[model samples]
Target: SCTIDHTIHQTLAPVVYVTVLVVGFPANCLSLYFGYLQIKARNELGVYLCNLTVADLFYICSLPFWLQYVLQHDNWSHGDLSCQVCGILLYENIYISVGFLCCISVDRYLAVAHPFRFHQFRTLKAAVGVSVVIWAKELLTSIYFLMHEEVIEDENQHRVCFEHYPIQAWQRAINYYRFLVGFLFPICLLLASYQGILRAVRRSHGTQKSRKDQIQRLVLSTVVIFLACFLPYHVLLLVRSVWEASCDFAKGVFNAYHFSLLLTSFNCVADPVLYCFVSETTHRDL
Candidate 1:
């Protein structure tokens, strides 16, 4: 049984949401310009970078509803339709961002390790194809999210949106899918890409230390951002789904989930920093 606890989000969500909105909005707004410049220069990586910025933009803009939701202590004053739209935006932004980051890592891996061998994939056309594929994937998944109602009343009749506990069958299945394919699969790809970069860099002839350092930071930051934004949410989600028998587990997981929710949204802010500020060509101008 889930207790109606308002302490966590009511106390902390406002601050985090505010930081995400205030900082993330401006940063990602600037990312558009950088993304444009990169594409203008015929940089293939810009395509994924641009899409990442778009994903973050969609989520960042929708935080106002989230801010309202938390401020009202789980109340969704927005109509159920609004909740559905926001829900679609939320889930779409999350995994779409994840997919793009993975694409970035893959692209970088090819750029470093396979170089000329993957030039076909290093084209803007390939990037466009990849973007189309990811956004198409999200468009299909949106139906799953929209199929479920976003708002439900608690025992006390307080309206809540996009949350349910003691996991239902569909939710359990979806969580498993999200955890494995959306989260874990991407993690493996990112790690492999990092390893490829390391090996390729080590074998290269007379690469500048500064250049190696930048690639290292970009790779390191992408992994860190992915883990930081997603690991806690998906991890605890699995934990809770497995064992909801104890009130101790339930209560602790509840608060942790709320905290992870906040941390996860920080992706909007962190993406700009990772893609635009630290990436080689993108950062070179800025």
Candidate 2:
């Protein structure tokens, strides 16, 4: 019995994944190439941006496997290891990007708000160290999913990966962890960094008016993208986990939750626009 929620899932997942892959692949590829050139030129900023592009590309490449899984109505023919690999790639992409965005926001604040102090911390070595820690943390945290049986045959005989994991309590705990670490903590840091940038700009010389305006725009756009892409997903996830609701109510929440998952992919598209607009060197390279 295919419910309306199942129908929505079948339609939404592949469509969103394919569309994201089509657009994100080329943009992230170009972003990656430009990032490489920036690295070659010894740009420390590129250290973060380049790794950001790298994360996006890996996620983009993993989409086709997901697309196939969705189109086949959650039947995962790929071995469990393959399913786990794709899941880890997607997990790493989200948190890794979050870590890099925080790094970039801090870098921008230091460069614009405290030029003298910027030299003390904004070295290539520091950026590289930050990237390594982010990767290490993401991998360590996500290894839990791989350790468990994330892919399993559901009661309906459909082989589902991650979707049909049997550990409800563990899933709830991890969901809270993801909400805090992946969304809440990073967003708080980002907002604080941007606020510092704005305050410094206001107190500094009038010569930085243009740069201040740019930072203002970046701040607005970053907030919009972060809230739009991530907030609803996590919120609905929390709701779905906690609310023991009626069947129709649960169905509605399920539909919205999956749709929010699709919305997260939009960040991949939004990020390259940020790169081109905010960084003059990146713009020229692009």
Candidate 3:
């Protein structure tokens, strides 16, 4: 009746969590530093990739706290307020990271598909502007939650963080917005851009071949890593959201959250593979 029995599950969860935490942190750190050097050297997608590395680093940084919480069998010694802070930052990082990735994809699209406009489009100032918009949005969302919400002890005496908005309408509308902006729109842009880049790669000749080939490889690699790490998480999150709307969260919420945590941890492992092909110059600068 379930995906797997509790016995096998308990064993796998800890192993996976620790393994991801141990490996992901240092790797992301290296990527960030190398990305920094790449920026200093010649500055292309370095800004966006550096932003991605920082996101990965932030998420990985939170792993130890999560590990401790999980090790305690999901029992939080961390207090209600602390739980809300943890939950909020974790959620914030997810959105910010995806937003940055979307920027990177769009940046690539403009650069490759329209070369005349490429130099005009690419600049630290523009990258900074895009990044600021993404972070500002994420910050506002986090602040809204922080201001109006708190973790409370439920009937089972478990401390859980949840919105305490006065109006359910507002909450529902925001959730729908989240699905649109956070998942649907960005993913659509990525797919469209990837297709265009691939087409450009296939049709190129002469000097265009080398640069086009490199750009195609880079974009493809980035897309694969992004989808591999995020698709499962998004699918499971959407399904669980639907399931909850159809019923109540209390009945199966733990399983849903556990799945989210597992899937979120995957980005750390997937990100480094794409980092390699960014450019020899990019890699060397780091």
Candidate 4:
């Protein structure tokens, strides 16, 4: 009963999501390819750009399936196994993207302010290793989630994934853990590192006309861009959460959740764009 009705929505959703798939994937793939080209060209900026593109590509690959599900389609047609695989991949990309952005910032910091440490930066092998670790962690977390989640029949007579037992506790804990680790901690590090870079810039005896200024502007733009996209989305989510709290009306909570999730999806598309601005080579490739 639940499955068939959702199929109609699936049809409608594909039309919209096709745009996402077409536009997002090509852009991300180009970024990844160009990122490598930058590496070969010995562009220091390419170090972070390449990693960012890879993360975007991973998320882009999973877009179609998620679009279908959200459009109210429920075939699990891809199989229950894909349920965890795709979900984990999507979540993993988000965190990995953040991690890469942070790395880019740090790299820029070294290149600009700490010339001595610059030699330690821009290692292709080290970047790949970090990416590998990110994927591994995501896979492990996904497995834990899948094990604990059950497709239970809701009162609406629809089978939705639900977590029970120890798994439920793990899920809840992970949510807060993500909030702290992904956003809070990275932000602090970014600020501190950038500040250190600024001081280094001040102490150096040179014209402000060097390539570092361009990099500074680019890095500043990246941070500003991230906050601009992400802050509004989060604020709206917070608003909707509060709205739900204040409401007892029919569909109040559900509507809040739906709207919040919609904005959340925008982060995936918006994030990769930041990578483009952060690295000059990325912009040139475009």
State TM-scores per candidate.
Answer: 0.92, 0.89, 0.80, 0.73
Task: For residues 1-286, write the lDDT of model 1, one tens digit per residue.
Answer: 4764658778877888898789988899899889899898889978888898988888888889878887775568766587877877865568898888889888878887886696676888988998999988887877667666656788766777777665566787777777889877888998988998888997887988787787677667667767877898888777877766366666666787777767888788887887787646754775
Q: Is candidate 1 or candidate 4 better by TM-score?
A: 1
TM-score (C-alpha, index-matched) for candidate 1:
0.92
> What RMSD, rounded to one decimal, does every model reach?
2.1, 2.6, 4.4, 5.2
Candidate achieving higher TM-score, 3 or 4: 3
Candidate 2, superposed: residue stretches over 4 Å from native: 1-5, 165-167, 208-211, 245-252
CA error at residue 185 for candidate 1, angstroms: 0.9
Candidate 1, superposed: residue stretches over 4 Å from native: 209-214, 245-249, 279-286
Span of ten consecutive residues with least summed lDDT in model 3: 1-10
Better of 3 and 4 by lDDT: 3
Off by over 4 Å in 3: 1-11, 154-158, 161-172, 207-221, 243-257, 276-279, 282-286
Name the lDDT of candidate 3. 0.66
Please write out the lDDT profile of model 3 over residues 171-271, one tens digit for every residue. Answer: 55665567677878888988998798778667767656477767667777777777766676666555555445433343345465556656666776677
Task: List where candidate 4 sits over 4 angstroms from the true fold.
Answer: 1-19, 43-47, 73-76, 161-168, 198-217, 231-251, 277-286
Per-residue lDDT of model 2, residues 97-141, tens digit only: 878889888888888877876585888898889889988887787
- Cα deviation in Å at residue 21, candidate 3? 1.5
lDDT of each residue in 1-286, candidate 4, tens digit only: 2122233343445655667678778677766777778788767667677766766777778877776566553434555566666766654456777777677767767776667665744676766676678768766766576555555554355434322212233454555566667778778878888888867765767646586677568558767766754454445434443333332332333433334333444455665666653556556665
TM-score top scorer: 1
